[PDB]
Paper text:
Here, we describe the tsclx4-/Zn-directed assembly of two proteins: cationic α-helical cytochrome c (cyt c) and neutral β-propeller Ralstonia solanacearum lectin (RSL). Sulfonato-thiacalixarene (tsclx4) provides possibilities for protein surface recognition (e.g., lysine encapsulation) while simultaneously supporting a metal site that can bind to other features on the protein. Whereas sulfonato-calixarene (sclx4) consists of phenol monomers linked by methylene bridges, tsclx4 is bridged by sulfur atoms that enable metal coordination. In each of the model systems, incorporation of the macrocycle–metal complexes contributed to protein assembly and crystal packing.
In the presence of magnesium, the cyt c and tsclx4 co-crystals were diamond-shaped plates with dimensions of 100–200 μm. Crystals of cyt c and tsclx4 grown in the presence of MgCl2 diffracted to 1.7 Å resolution at SOLEIL synchrotron. The calixarene formed multiple noncovalent bonds (e.g., hydrogen bonds between sulfonates and neighboring residues) and acted as a molecular glue. Therefore, in the absence of a transition metal, tsclx4 binds cyt c similar to other calixarenes, suggesting that the sulfur bridging atoms had minimal effect on the protein-binding capabilities of the macrocycle.
Numbering used by the authors:
A (entry chain A), B (entry chain B): -5 to -1, 1 to 103
The structure:
Amino acid sequence: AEFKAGSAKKGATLFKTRCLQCHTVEKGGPHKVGPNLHGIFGRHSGQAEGYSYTDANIKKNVLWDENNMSEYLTNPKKYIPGTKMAFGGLKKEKDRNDLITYLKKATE
Amino acid sequence: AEFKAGSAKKGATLFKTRCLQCHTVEKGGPHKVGPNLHGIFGRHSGQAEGYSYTDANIKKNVLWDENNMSEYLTNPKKYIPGTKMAFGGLKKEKDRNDLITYLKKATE
Ligand SMILES: O=S(=O)(O)c1cc2c(O)c(c1)Sc1cc(S(=O)(=O)O)cc(c1O)Sc1cc(S(=O)(=O)O)cc(c1O)Sc1cc(S(=O)(=O)O)cc(c1O)S2
Ligand SMILES: O=S(=O)(O)c1cc2c(O)c(c1)Sc1cc(S(=O)(=O)O)cc(c1O)Sc1cc(S(=O)(=O)O)cc(c1O)Sc1cc(S(=O)(=O)O)cc(c1O)S2
Ligand SMILES: O=S(=O)(O)c1cc2c(O)c(c1)Sc1cc(S(=O)(=O)O)cc(c1O)Sc1cc(S(=O)(=O)O)cc(c1O)Sc1cc(S(=O)(=O)O)cc(c1O)S2
Ligand code: HEC
Ligand code: HEC
């Protein structure tokens, strides 16, 4: 994947309408169906404190960056087989770019 | 992974010592053990004319770019499970960057 910075505004709206049902981003924000995502970039997968991950999420042991996050979000189950994240994926490169542009700033 | 442009000259040495046994780069070059790699960037995996890939490499259908190339070369069997490319991986990040710098130029 080739992440390129897009519209953080449109990405905020994508997060709100497709991810917020299971995730928060803010420092200290609640765990819900999925883990709070503060600090996700530059951390290995499966390490938010207080959350119970699948073994596959921890064991994939990917160091998240803008590029492997784009590949993951295209089809989560294909990048992390066995993940309990119920999400088919964002197929459009432009939507992933916008969303990841937002995530990069909102999760710090 | 995050590609960062490096030294084409060092990349060329890395290709000769670590890849040339199994691959060539020139247009019309021979399939040795692995496919000739001319045109690899911006093409999906498993498409070099005349080579017989594993089903795994074809099904992967990755659109090759500098970032997923670096991730692949770090550990090919992790990125394309089932591949017949017998190569443990290039663990040094600078070597990956240099080699991809060379590959982008030499496969065109
Ligand atoms: O995520 S969105 O809500 O935005 C979304 C956008 C599009 C869309 O059709 C859908 C959902 S609906 C859908 C849902 C699921 S799933 O949820 O069950 O997995 C699987 C499929 C599927 O069709 S099959 C399929 C899978 C993939 S892949 O997974 O990316 O390899 C690519 C294409 C394709 O047909 S082709 C293709 C290529 C592009 S482009 O922009 O990359 O050129 C865009 C689209 C394509 O269909 S529009
Ligand atoms: O901007 S770049 O970083 O890409 C870059 C471009 C060039 C360059 O010199 C360098 C760095 S500096 C350099 C780097 C490395 S290293 O990084 O590999 O350790 C080893 C050496 C070296 O001098 S020693 C050496 C060994 C041989 S050999 O005995 O024939 O193998 C030929 C040449 C040579 O200098 S001459 C030669 C050969 C080539 S080539 O790649 O077409 O073979 C290119 C050039 C040459 O001057 S331009
Ligand atoms: O380039 S070479 O392929 O010749 C090569 C270079 C280095 C090296 O140790 C080896 C081979 S030997 C080796 C072989 C195998 S294998 O046989 O199972 O494949 C597994 C490992 C292993 O260590 S374990 C391991 C795996 C990875 S990862 O796979 O990249 O995540 C990173 C590191 C690490 O320890 S840490 C690490 C980080 C860097 S840096 O430059 O990126 O900072 C460099 C090195 C590191 O060890 S030097
Ligand atoms: C409920 C149906 C979810 C939706 C919608 C989204 N996510 Fe998700 N996510 C969910 C769960 C239950 C988990 C844990 C999965 C496991 O196997 O343990 C996750 C995980 C992630 C991760 C990895 C977190 C980490 O490694 O620490 C990421 C990066 C992630 N989720 C991102 C994400 C995005 C960007 C979403 C909108 C496109 C999204 N998720 C939606 C549950 C659900
Ligand atoms: C023999 C021991 C090999 C070594 C050394 C290298 N490669 Fe390889 N490669 C090899 C095979 C048999 C295959 C086909 C694998 C399959 O499952 O069909 C490949 C494939 C690749 C690819 C993908 C090709 C494509 O999708 O068209 C790439 C990008 C690739 N090889 C790169 C590569 C590099 C950079 C190497 C040096 C670090 C290297 N290979 C060494 C066999 C062998």
